[PDB]
Structure formats: C-alpha cells, structure tokens
Amino acid sequence: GHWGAWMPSTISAFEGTCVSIPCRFDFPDELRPAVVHGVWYFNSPYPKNYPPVVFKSRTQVVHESFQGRSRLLGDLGLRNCTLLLSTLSPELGGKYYFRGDLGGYNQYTFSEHSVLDIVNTPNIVVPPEVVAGTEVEVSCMVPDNCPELRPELSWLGHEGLGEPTVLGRLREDEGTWVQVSLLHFVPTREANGHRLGCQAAFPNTTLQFEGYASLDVKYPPVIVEMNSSVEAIEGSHVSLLCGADSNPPPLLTWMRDGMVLREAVAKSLYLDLEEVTPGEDGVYACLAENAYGQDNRTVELSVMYAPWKPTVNGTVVAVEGETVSILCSTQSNPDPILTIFKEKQILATVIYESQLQLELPAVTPEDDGEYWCVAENQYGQRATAFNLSVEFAPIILLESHCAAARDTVQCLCVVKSNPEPSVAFELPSTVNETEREFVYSERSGLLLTSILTIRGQAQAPPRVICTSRNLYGTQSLELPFQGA
Amino acid sequence: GHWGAWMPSTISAFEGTCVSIPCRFDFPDELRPAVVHGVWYFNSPYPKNYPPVVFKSRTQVVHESFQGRSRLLGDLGLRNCTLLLSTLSPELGGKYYFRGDLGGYNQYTFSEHSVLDIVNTPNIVVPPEVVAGTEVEVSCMVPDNCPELRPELSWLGHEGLGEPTVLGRLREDEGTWVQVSLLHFVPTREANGHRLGCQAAFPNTTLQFEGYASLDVKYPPVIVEMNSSVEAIEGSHVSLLCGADSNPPPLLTWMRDGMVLREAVAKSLYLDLEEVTPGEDGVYACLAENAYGQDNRTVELSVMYAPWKPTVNGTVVAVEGETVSILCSTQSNPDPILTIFKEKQILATVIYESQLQLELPAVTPEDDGEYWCVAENQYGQRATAFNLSVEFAPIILLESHCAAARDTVQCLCVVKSNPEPSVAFELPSTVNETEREFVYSERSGLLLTSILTIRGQAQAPPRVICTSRNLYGTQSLELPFQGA
Ligand SMILES: CC(=O)N[C@@H]1[C@@H](O[C@@H]2O[C@H](CO)[C@H](O)[C@H](O[C@]3(C(=O)O)C[C@H](O)[C@@H](NC(C)=O)[C@H]([C@H](O)[C@H](O)CO)O3)[C@H]2O)[C@@H](O)[C@@H](CO)O[C@H]1O
Ligand SMILES: CC(=O)N[C@@H]1[C@@H](O[C@@H]2O[C@H](CO)[C@H](O)[C@H](O[C@]3(C(=O)O)C[C@H](O)[C@@H](NC(C)=O)[C@H]([C@H](O)[C@H](O)CO)O3)[C@H]2O)[C@@H](O)[C@@H](CO)O[C@H]1O
Ligand SMILES: *[C@@H]1O[C@H](CO[C@@H]2O[C@@H](C)[C@@H](O)[C@@H](O)[C@@H]2O)[C@@H](O)[C@H](O)[C@H]1NC(C)=O
Ligand SMILES: *[C@@H]1O[C@H](CO[C@@H]2O[C@@H](C)[C@@H](O)[C@@H](O)[C@@H]2O)[C@@H](O)[C@H](O)[C@H]1NC(C)=O
Ligand SMILES: *[C@@H]1O[C@H](CO)[C@@H](O)[C@H](O)[C@H]1NC(C)=O
Ligand SMILES: *[C@@H]1O[C@H](CO)[C@@H](O)[C@H](O)[C@H]1NC(C)=O
Ligand SMILES: *[C@@H]1O[C@H](CO)[C@@H](O)[C@H](O)[C@H]1NC(C)=O
Ligand SMILES: *[C@@H]1O[C@H](CO)[C@@H](O)[C@H](O)[C@H]1NC(C)=O
Ligand SMILES: *[C@@H]1O[C@H](CO)[C@@H](O)[C@H](O)[C@H]1NC(C)=O
Ligand SMILES: *[C@@H]1O[C@H](CO)[C@@H](O)[C@H](O)[C@H]1NC(C)=O
Ligand SMILES: *[C@@H]1O[C@H](CO)[C@@H](O)[C@H](O)[C@H]1NC(C)=O
Ligand SMILES: *[C@@H]1O[C@H](CO)[C@@H](O)[C@H](O)[C@H]1NC(C)=O
Ligand SMILES: *[C@H]1O[C@H](CO)[C@@H](O)[C@H](O)[C@@H]1O
Ligand SMILES: *[C@H]1O[C@H](CO)[C@@H](O)[C@H](O)[C@@H]1O
C-alpha cells in the first residue's frame, strides 16, 4: 500500500503501571529492504529538532527519561511496532510519534500520534437524573491497558446498596481496553450527598488508586418545619414559617381560603403579618410542590383581642309591673365573662359566653336608674351604660306636712312618679283679694317637691289638701300640722 | 270881645231824663242891637243845609223831634243860652250847634259844639290790679246833668263787702257834673268772678238803670288736686297730676331730688312715666309759684316688682362635722317671704325680710345634694340653686359580698365617700400566670361600686379583702360568701 500507520489517538494508565500502545505501519511494497528499523520519538516528531529517544533499533542508548523504562514488542518485519512503557511517571505524559528507517532517505515519521494520559484516579459514571423512586445503575471504568498488571475493582462506601456485578475488559474507542464494574441499587431520599467510592488495586503491588463521587438523587419535598397552633394579638407581628426539604429546588406557596398570598422558590418561606385583624384569623396552609412530588401542612391562626364595647338593645321604658327583657351582646375573640349591675347591687353574671340576658318580671319603682354592662376579659375590658325608667301612679310621701308660722302658713307635699305629676293645692274656703297663694315646685329624681305659702291665714289652721295626677293614677293627702 | 262861645265838648244823661247844656257866647261889643235872638240847630250847623230846629227865638214851631221836648233858660241878653231837653230818647243823640241872630247879616253859628251822649247804664270803675291781700276801693259814677231829676246810687250785690260811702256831685271836665258813690272793701281769693252792681234811680219816677262789673282779683295759687301715695308696677304707665288754682296764670313745676324734670304755665300739669324703674321710686314734689305767692305738695311714689333672682354666697364644700354657713340675699321692692329647701324637706323659712341665713352645725353625709332658694312674693317668684358637697372617710357598706360561681369567683364591695376612693382587692396567696384578676368600678352619687373577678379559683373560697382610701381615712372589710 502507501506509507502510514494505525495507532490509538488517546490512551491512558496509572502511575507505576505499564502501557501497551498497540500499532501497525506500512510502506510501499515496491521496495524490499530487509532489516526494517524504526524509532520512537517522545514529544517531537522530526530529528532536526532533537526529541527524546523512547526506542531506536539496535541502540541501548535512549533518553535518560526512558532508560530501562521502554521496550518494543513484535518483529518490525511483520510491521508490528507496539511499545511498552513500565514504571510510568507524570513526566511521561505526552505525545508519542513513530518513525521508520529502512534504507537511506527512505525515512518516514508517521503523522498519526498517540497521546499518553496518566491518571491517578478511577472513573465513576452517574446518570444526570437520579430519581429516588427509580432503580439507577452506576459504573466504574478503569483503563486496563497494561499487559503486566491486572486491576481489580472494589466498590467502597457502597455499604447497604446492592452488591456489585463484575464485568471484564471492554472495547474502548479503537484499540484500548477498560475494566468496568457495575452497581445496581435504589436510592432513599436521604441518599443525596452520599459519597460513593471505587478502588482499583493490583495483587502483588502496593498500588491503590481511590476515586470518589457524591450522588445527586432527586427527591420530592417533605415539609419538616411547621408551627403548631399560633394564637396571636391584634396589631402584633406574626411570622409564619414553612420549611421544606427537597433536592431539586422546591416551590413554596402560602395559601389561605383558595387565594395566592405569597409564593417563592426557596428552602424556607416567611409570611409576615403586621396589624393583625380578626379577619386574618383562620387556617393557613403551606403547599410545597415539586416536579417529583408534593407535601402540605396547615396551621390554625387565632387572633385574640379584648371584646368590643357591649351593645345593649331591648326595652328602655316600661310601666310598673311590666316585664323588662334586656340582652347585652358582645363579640369577642377570646371568650369572655361579663356582668351587668346597678349601684350597690349586681343583677346577673354569665361566664365564657357571647351574650347575657336580664329579665325583670315585675318592675318596682326602685328599678329606675342607670345600669352598667361590663364585658370583662383577659386582654382588656370595656363597658357600656343603659338607663331603665319606670313609670307609675304618683305616691304622696308621708314626709309631707303643713307648718304654720306666726303670720302665715306654708305647706309642703312630696310625691314620687316618673312622669312628673301636676301638683295642686285645695282648701274649703270664697275668692279673696290677692294676696295670692303661690307655689314653687322643683324636681329631683322621681321626687316632685313643692311648697305652698298661704298668707295672712287666721290662727285657726286651714285644711290644706295636696293632689297630684299623672296618666296612670291620682292621689290626694289631707295634710297634717306640726305645732310648736 | 270877639265872636265865640263856651260849651262842654261831651255831655251825657239817661233815657227819660233831661239834660242841661250850659253855655255862654259873645259878639263884638261894637254893635249894640237890642233883642238878641238865637237858634239851636241839631246835627247840622248852617241854614243852607236844613237842620232840625231845637229852638228858635219867638217861634213855637220847632222840629217834631223836639216839639215840647226843648226849652231855653236865661235871657240871651246876658249872653246865657243854656238849653234843657226833657224826655230824652236814643234819637236825640247827636251834635248840637248854637247860632245867634242879632240884626241882619250879623248871624253867626259858633264853631264849638256839644255832643249829647245818652246812656242807659251807670259807670263802674275798678283799678287794674286787685290783689286779694290788699284793701281796694271801687267807684260808681253817674252823669248828674239834669236839673229836674236827682239820681240816687245803690250798690247791689255788694252783700258782705263794706258799706258804701256816699259822695256828692263832682266837677267833670269843664262844666259837667257826676254823682259818685265809693265802696271800700277787702277781697277773698274767691272774690274773682263775682258780679258787682250799681243802680241809679229817681224818687218819683219808675226809671231804674242797673250796671254790672265782674271783678278780677289776683290771688296766689293753692294746689287743690294732688294724688295720695301712689304705688306702681315697673313698666306700667304712671300719670302724676298737679292741679293749681290761681287767677293769674300759675307757673307749675315738677321736681324731684333738686332737679328740673317738667315745667309749664297751666292750671294742671301731667307727669307721664313709662317703663318705671326702682330708681323712679321716691318722693315727687309739685311746686306752684306765682308773683303773688306759692304752694307745694309731695307724693310718695312706690315702684313694686317681683324680687330679683336670689344670690347665694358662702361655703360650697365642707368636710364632715364642720359648720356650714349659707346666706341667701335678695333685694325686693315689695317685702317678700322666702325659703330654702332640699328634696323631701324644708330647712328654713323667713317672712317679709331681705335675706335668710342657714347654718348647719355638724354636717352629716346626707347633707350633700342640691338645694333651692326661692324668693317668693306677690308680684312674682324667682329661685336660684346651690350645691353643698360634704367630704368624709369612705364607709364600706355591708351590702358587699363574695358570690362564687362554679368555675370562678367574683366579689363586689361598695363604699360611699365624696372624694372618690381608691378601691383595692387583697388576698393571702404567690404570683400566678395571668389569668389576671380584673376589676371594674363605676361611680354614682357618693357610691363607688366595684366588681372583681378572680378566675379558676379552687372550690375552697379564697379570703377576699376590700380596701378603699381617701384623704380623710381608710377602711377594709374582709368580705363574706353567699353559698347556694
Ligand atoms: C515535509 C514536511 O511537512 N516537513 C516539515 C519539516 O521539515 C522536515 O525536516 C526534517 C529534518 O530532518 C526532514 O528533512 C523532513 O523530511 C524527511 C525526514 O527526514 O523526516 C525526509 C524523508 O526522506 C522524507 N520521506 C521520504 C519518503 O523520503 C520524510 C517524510 O516525508 C516526512 O518525515 C513525513 O512527515 O521527511 C522535513 O519534512 C519542518 O519544516 C516542520 C516545521 O517547519 O514542518 C514540516 O511540515
Ligand atoms: C265861611 C265858612 O267857613 N262857611 C262854609 C259854608 O258856607 C256857609 O253857607 C251859609 C249858608 O247860609 C252862609 O252863607 C255862611 O256864611 C254866614 C251864615 O249865614 O252863617 C253869613 C254870616 O253873615 C257870617 N258871619 C258874619 C259875622 O257876617 C256867618 C259866619 O261867618 C259863619 O256862619 C261862621 O261859621 O256865615 C257860609 O259860611 C259851607 O260852604 C260849608 C260846606 O261847604 O263850609 C263852610 O266852611
Ligand atoms: C339587637 O342587637 C343584637 C346584637 O347586636 C349585634 O351584635 C352586636 C355584638 C353588635 O355587633 C351590634 O352592632 C350588632 O347589631 C342582636 O343579636 C339582636 O338580635 C338584636 N335584636 C333586637 C333589636 O333586639
Ligand atoms: C355675699 O354677697 C351678699 C349679697 O350680694 C349682694 O346683694 C345681692 C342682693 C345681689 O345684689 C348681689 O349682686 C350683691 O353682690 C353680701 O350682702 C354679703 O356681704 C357678701 N359677703 C360674702 C361674700 O359672703
Ligand atoms: C503485535 O504484537 C503484540 C504483542 O506481541 C500483539 O499483542 C499484537 O496482536 C501484535 N499485532 C499484530 C501481530 O498485528
Ligand atoms: C414558628 O416557628 C419558627 C421556627 O421554625 C419561629 O421562629 C416562629 O417564631 C414561630 N411562629 C410563631 C408565631 O411563634
Ligand atoms: C395537600 O396535598 C394533597 C395531595 O398530597 C391534596 O389532595 C390536597 O388538596 C392538598 N391540600 C391543600 C390545602 O393544598
Ligand atoms: C341616666 O340617667 C342619669 C340620671 O340618674 C343621667 O345622669 C344619665 O346621663 C342617664 N344616662 C343615659 C344613657 O340616659
Ligand atoms: C245861665 O242860666 C242857667 C239857668 O238859669 C244858670 O244855671 C247859669 O248859671 C247861667 N249862667 C250865667 C248867668 O252865666
Ligand atoms: C292721680 O289723680 C288723678 C285725678 O286727679 C287721676 O286721674 C290719676 O290716675 C291719679 N294717679 C294715679 C297714679 O292713680
Ligand atoms: C315749699 O314751700 C315752702 C314755702 O311755702 C318752702 O319753704 C319749701 O322749701 C318748699 N318746698 C319745696 C319742696 O319746694
Ligand atoms: C348639683 O349636683 C347635681 C348632682 O346631684 C347636678 O345634677 C347639678 O347640676 C349640680 N348643680 C350645681 C349648681 O352644681
Ligand atoms: C509514501 O510516501 C508518500 C506518502 O503519501 C506517497 O508517495 C506514497 O503514499 C508512499 O507510499
Ligand atoms: C267876629 O267875627 C270874626 C270872627 O273871628 C272876627 O271878625 C271878629 O272876631 C268878630 O268879633
């Protein structure tokens, strides 16, 4: 054929082991020179620029960087120029050209070259996506290009994961071999961040090459941080925390009542509430969702505040004996105990209830007066006042009398009634020049107090009769005298 | 001498009597004709214009208006041509010329003529000013020019006035006589407007001639119309009347307090007062003054109106047992009876006095309350209100108790005091999580009503002790319980 050569492009082995660069070459058959000679140049391809001599036919003298480090396999007559390099060092990493020298001027450095890689760590392969719920296999590939040493693979750190299935050397690229050992297992959610190792060693040697890899198994989110039932005060500051554990980024969503609120892709998400209202009260849910699953939790938020000022509706005015129904109603976030009461006495009390009802079957006059409803509670108390008035027929009090002075007589009669009664004075006497009797009447509470003055009345005290009328009834007391 | 004649200018007598026109004439002595003749022409002086012939020598034929009515006295030889005309009538009033006819062409009508007045009424003379206090004389003159009849004068209507002093005939002007009768008297104030008369009559005849005159005696003013003590209402209308009796115009002057007010020259003078004030009250004097005297009277004017609203000054605040002095003072035009009083009781009363004083030696708490001072009176009543407050050490009322409910206990203690006392609750227990006790305290009158609620207290009722402090004192009641 024509000039040329076959050689692997890339080839590799470990520090301290050998390599075996396989090859083959060709020259024009047209020439028949016996004793085919060749040379192996490191780094550089042509003689002009002196390269290190890896091998040269019928010369023990080579580069000191290969002395006792190189040897050729195969008769070059059969065009077989495979080269072995024992005891490798990082220095020996480089490109290796091959050149042939048959006869004179028939010398050719072949353009195809192999590049020698020297690694000190094995190769662990892992698929891009490693879902937790799915079986996933991983391999371990080590360049078995050495005829003198035979690597054996050992999964370390595999622990509880399934046992390794060993495989032999396999064809890599064109003309290079590699020993592979597989590993079949299933990953827990936790498995992410676990360090998995593969070790290659050689039976008689002290050579051991370890190599690590940390897995990245994807798992759905599990909400691990969530508040218990939160009970907060109005206007206070409320921080809700939703934590989530997921390998892929999780999406966090705060929701309540079918609404959006706050949403973010993070490991934890705060919901800050300022100026808290009873409308903020309710159950809040945090939803965590990932393409690989989801999880959600709820928390009951309870807003607590002192009850509002009580509202009292019912009956304000009522005649005697009628039945007065009064209810005192107040909404409160924390259940509260409340009570209503007049001065000097407490009418009714209810405990931990929304509203209290007071009923007075028959109403005496003493029921007239202002009342108080207090909505007592842990977080504060507010009250409200309501008045209850009671109407009745006027009652002329026996505190009434006719005191006479030396020249004139004057009388006082007091009655009580809620509708202020028409006071009047009568006396059996005819009409006189005036000298007109004149009364004055001031009112305080239910009491109508009125004082008459009859002037120039004879020493014999005149019968004075007091009468007062309201809508409901009438009364008339013939007044007494208080001499000396 | 020369031609000429003497004759009275004016001369008069009554209807029905005679006249006696005296005369005398003269002609040039140079001529000596015997048998001097003359004529008396009425009205006209010369013959050309025919006049009535009163007399003509040696002719019985005269004017028919003088036939048997005329006659001549004295020989014309002695130049005496006096003429008498009996039975006079109003017709015979006129001028009378005299003319002489001695010889031919020696005829002369003398330029001097007498005019005959005929009156039917006497002449009464009165001085211009007739002061009442002064003696004043009046005369009565009657023309005594008749030789045949002799008038006699008689004062009629003179009555109580001094008797008349008769006088004889007196020389009037030149050649006429008049009978005068005087009258000496003194005039009362009343005498003005009195009719005084003088009558002349003749003994044998039926002829009587009366003549009157009404006197105008000046007298000082005497105030005869004057009001008694006038007692009037404010804003009413007041008419003061001052009447005065005087012949000359009197000057009327209304005065008070040394001031002018109203002044007028009249018989009566009104002082009208509208919108009467207590400042109008006082004594008003009416002065009457005339150049001939003066008189004056006074009237007390009293303005009456309901008392003003009472003013109460003194002490409003006072501790227990202290003495409270309060006075209620009110000015009033009509004296009024007033009184002060609380509800249901009347403290004090005074009658017909300007002010009333109330004193409360020791002040109990029940003295706290509003008081009324009413200034009662005939013409209206007004009042005023004053409050009296009384401070004292708080008194914890035995209406207080500790009522327990099934889950919680609540206590009520009421105290009374005017300075609102600091209520407090104590109990022998250490500090607990809260669950904080909470009290409510409303105030009404002197009563501080307060209710505690102690929550979750064990079935065994805890000792509750109520304490209240004011400036004056402190009290503490260990409260009781009311089971079932
Ligand atoms: C041709 C070429 O691309 N070479 C360039 C380089 O120059 C080389 O220099 C060396 C120095 O000894 C040689 O002269 C070489 O030619 C020879 C050799 O000795 O390798 C002569 C041989 O006889 C000849 N072949 C045959 C069949 O006779 C060989 C052979 O053709 C080549 O080696 C094949 O690669 O070549 C010169 O080629 C030098 O200029 C470098 C850098 O500039 O560039 C090369 O392209
Ligand atoms: C002079 C005179 O003022 N007279 C005026 C009037 O005229 C008279 O008319 C009468 C008519 O008879 C006489 O003519 C009068 O004269 C006499 C008489 O007869 O009275 C004539 C007498 O002789 C003569 N006196 C003497 C001494 O002789 C008298 C005598 O002198 C007067 O009487 C004296 O008063 O007069 C006329 O005088 C006549 O015109 C009236 C109206 O117009 O006015 C007279 O002034
Ligand atoms: C009277 O009103 C009662 C309660 O009033 C309502 O509730 C209170 C807490 C406040 O919110 C107030 O504003 C509300 O109006 C009712 O429950 C009751 O049925 C009503 N009925 C009447 C008029 O007696
Ligand atoms: C308090 O005042 C008394 C009276 O007040 C006066 O008289 C009354 C009628 C009203 O006219 C009022 O305007 C006047 O001021 C005094 O008489 C008394 O002296 C006073 N003394 C006090 C202050 O106690
Ligand atoms: C070249 O020699 C090597 C070592 O003897 C051998 O492995 C390879 O098969 C040979 N190649 C040939 C003969 O083509
Ligand atoms: C909820 O829990 C977080 C810790 O995970 C805490 O910081 C926060 O205060 C809690 N929320 C409330 C309202 O206490
Ligand atoms: C929580 O997730 C479940 C499924 O895991 C879903 O059925 C449910 O509706 C979710 N709840 C909320 C409030 O999102
Ligand atoms: C109730 O009546 C009292 C009088 O005793 C009065 O002071 C108060 O203002 C009244 N309150 C209402 C709400 O009517
Ligand atoms: C005129 O005569 C009368 C009457 O005889 C007489 O009164 C008067 O004195 C006589 N006058 C004389 C004479 O002068
Ligand atoms: C005073 O008296 C007159 C009558 O002389 C009378 O008209 C008037 O009304 C009186 N005045 C009063 C105030 O009565
Ligand atoms: C009244 O008149 C007398 C004299 O008649 C006099 O002294 C007195 O001052 C007068 N009074 C008045 C108030 O004018
Ligand atoms: C007096 O006190 C009463 C309360 O009992 C009040 O209603 C009234 O307005 C007070 N009056 C004065 C003048 O202070
Ligand atoms: C080798 O030398 C050159 C390389 O192409 C050619 O002349 C021929 O292929 C020969 O075999
Ligand atoms: C009368 O006549 C006239 C009047 O004066 C005069 O001549 C004389 O006075 C005589 O006596």
Residue numbers in the entry:
A (entry chain A), B (entry chain A): 20 to 448, 452 to 506
What's in the article?
We determined crystal structures of the full extracellular segment of mouse MAG (MAG1–5) in two different crystal forms that diffracted to a maximum resolution of 3.8 and 4.3 Å. These crystals were obtained by enzymatic deglycosylation of MAG1–5 or reductive lysine methylation of glycosylated MAG1–5 (see ‘Methods' section). The structures were solved by molecular replacement with individual Ig domains from homologous proteins. The exceptionally high-solvent content of the two MAG1–5 crystal forms (91 and 85%) aided in obtaining phases of sufficient quality for initial model building (see also Table 1 and ‘Methods' section for details). We observed unmodelled electron density in the 2Fo−Fc and Fo−Fc maps of the deglycosylated MAG1–5 structure close to R118 in the putative ligand-binding site20. Native mass spectrometry of purified MAG1–5 revealed a mixture of free and two ligand-bound MAG1–5 forms with mass differences of 835±2 and 854±2 Da compared with free MAG1–5. The 835 Da ligand possibly corresponds to a tetrasaccharide comprising the aforementioned Neu5Ac-α2,3-Gal-β1,3-GalNAc trisaccharide plus another hexose. The 854 Da ligand might correspond to a similar tetrasaccharide where Neu5Ac is replaced by Neu5Gc, a mammalian sialic acid variant not produced by humans. These ligands are likely co-purified in complex with MAG from the expression medium that contains beef digest (Primatone). The resolution of the MAG1–5–ligand complex (to 3.8 Å) is not sufficient to determine the detailed structure of the bound oligosaccharide. However, the unmodelled electron density is compatible with either of the suggested compounds.
